[PDB]
Paper text:
Containing a tandem array of 2–30 repeats, pentatricopeptide repeat (PPR) proteins constitute one of the largest protein families in land plants. Each PPR repeat aligns to a single nucleotide of the RNA target in modular patterns, making these proteins suitable for the development of exciting new biotechnologies. Within each repeat, the combinations of two amino acids, known as the PPR code at two key positions (the 5th and the 35th) confer RNA specificity. A typical RNA-bound dPPR protein adopts a right-handed superhelical spiral structure, with its target ssRNA molecule sitting in the interior cavity and interacting with corresponding PPR repeats in a modular fashion.
On the basis of previous investigation, we used dPPR scaffolds with four different codes: ND, NS, SN and TD. After numerous unsuccessful trials, we finally succeeded in crystallizing each dPPR-U8N2 in complex with its respective target ssRNA (5′-UUUUNNUUUU-3′), in space group P212121. When dPPR-U8C2 was superimposed on dPPR-U10, dPPR-U8A2 and dPPR-U8G2, the root mean square deviations were 0.73, 0.99 and 1.00 Å over 348, 367 and 374 Cα atoms, respectively. As observed in all four complex structures, four types of dPPR repeats recognize their corresponding targets by forming hydrogen bonds with the Watson–Crick faces of the nucleotides, which explains why PPR proteins bind ssRNAs instead of double stranded ones. We observed that water molecules between bases and PPR repeats mediate hydrogen bonds between the polar residues and the bases in the cases of uracil and cytosine recognition. Each water molecule between the base and corresponding PPR repeat forms two hydrogen bonds: one with the N3 atom of the pyrimidine and one with the carboxyl group of Asp35 or the hydroxyl group of Ser35. Interactions with the phosphate group of ssRNA, which are invariant for repeats 1 through 8, are mediated by salt bridges between Lys13 of repeat 1 and the 5′ phosphate group of U3, and between Lys13 of repeat 8 and the 5′ phosphate group of U10.
Numbering used by the authors: 37 to 424
RNA sequence: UUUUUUUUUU
């Protein structure tokens, strides 16, 4: 509202004010209103700049609308508004996270071709894409390459590689790398410790994780919500749910405020244990304390109910889910498809795939495998061949 | 004023 008022008087809105606003709308979520602000400013004769483009482009990548981001990239190049190292960083990230690492490497080549030097963020972004694509190998290569270029690895560089190494099973390497970053002027942070803690929990070394938690508290590094979500998931997975609820209480007492992941993590643990009551209790409680269940909450509950054989209840939560405006995803659909299919409700399952395709959700491997399976033991085999 | 790392669901 302050905008109209500022206009009203004699203050001509800058491009930075529109950029600030558009960023706000792109974070707050509402993308299409951001686009609308873009058109409004274009109209008023205020020229969108390279920051305007980068902002919208980022927001479109993170709304899943990649190809639209690329439309905007095209458009900015048409206008002579030259993409900069940030434009390319944004797009490289967007491509890596949409499973198009090869195209990302393309943009990486191209920016150099245009006299744009990759910076520490470019490298961090690619080392992350590389790791998450299984290519630890290439990631470390890149880590050598950036030092060759005189670009100084930062905390994010080390955090990224510590994580990749953990995820590949190489806990010992991650630890040695942690030591290396300390032996340098790089002070680890909450993320370094959170990453290491997660790595220790995943490898079944929960007490080493708790030790490390003590050490970060000692070293003056305040644990955050992620720290506690990580230890809570570790305890639930280790089968120690009492202790996890204890840590939950404890974080509330330490002034850490549980978020949606805290609640999903607990709901998962309780569902997996078969304590579907306590789980539903926490679902209602989170809504009560005003923490909006997302798609993972409902997915988690639905899978808990299907696994218990409470199909009706599960389906019901799917309905309530939609009615609350919560948009399903491929996980929701794989879960119900799976559950229906186990129940000899292959027809409905197929219908669920139909709807899935009709709302604009990609089916993914598991969906394919699953509906093929169900089509088979049915048994309509030509029906499956045509479905693929 | 915009871009990179850690935790939860099939």
């Amino acid at each position: 509202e302050l905008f109209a008022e500022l206009r009203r008087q004699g203050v001509a809105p800058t491009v930075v004010t529109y950029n600030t606003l558009i960023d706000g709308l792109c974070k707050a979520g509402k993308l299409d209103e951001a686009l609308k602000l873009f058109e409004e400013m274009v109209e008023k004769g205020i020229k969108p700049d390279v920051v305007t483009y980068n902002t919208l482009i980022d927001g479109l990548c993170k709304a899943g609308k990649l190809d639209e981001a690329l439309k905007l990239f095209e458009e900015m190049v048409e206008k002579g508004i030259k993409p900069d190292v940030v434009t390319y960083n944004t797009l490289i990230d967007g491509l890596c996270k949409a499973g198009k690492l090869d195209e990302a490497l393309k943009l990486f080549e191209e920016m150099v071709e245009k006299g744009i030097k990759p910076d520490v963020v470019t490298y961090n972004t690619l080392i992350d894409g590389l790791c998450k694509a299984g290519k630890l190998d290439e990631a470390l290569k890149l880590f050598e390459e950036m030092v060759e270029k005189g670009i100084k690895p930062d905390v994010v560089t080390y955090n990224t590689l510590i994580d990749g190494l953990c995820k590949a099973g190489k806990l010992d390497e991650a630890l040695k790398l942690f030591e290396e970053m300390v032996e340098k002027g790089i002070k680890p942070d909450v993320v370094t410790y959170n990453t290491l803690i997660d790595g220790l929990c995943k490898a079944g070394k929960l007490d080493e994780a708790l030790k490390l938690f003590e050490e970060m508290v000692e070293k003056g590094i305040k644990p955050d919500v992620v720290t506690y979500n990580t230890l809570i998931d570790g305890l639930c997975k280790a089968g120690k749910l009492d202790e996890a609820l204890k840590l939950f209480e404890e974080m509330v007492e330490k002034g850490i405020k549980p978020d949606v992941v805290t609640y999903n993590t607990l709901i998962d643990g309780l569902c997996k244990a078969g304590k579907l009551d306590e789980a539903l209790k926490l679902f209602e409680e989170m809504v009560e304390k005003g923490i909006k269940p997302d798609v993972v909450t409902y997915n988690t509950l639905i899978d808990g109910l299907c696994k218990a054989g409470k199909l009706d209840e599960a389906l019901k939560l799917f309905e309530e889910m939609v009615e609350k405006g919560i948009k399903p995803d491929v996980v929701t659909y794989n879960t119900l498809i799976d559950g229906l299919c186990k129940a000899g409700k292959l027809d409905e399952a197929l219908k669920l795939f139909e709807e899935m395709v009709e709302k604009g959700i990609k089916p993914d491997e598991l969906t394919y495998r699953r509906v093929v399976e169900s089509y088979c033991r049915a048994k309509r085999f030509e029906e499956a061949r045509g479905f693929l």
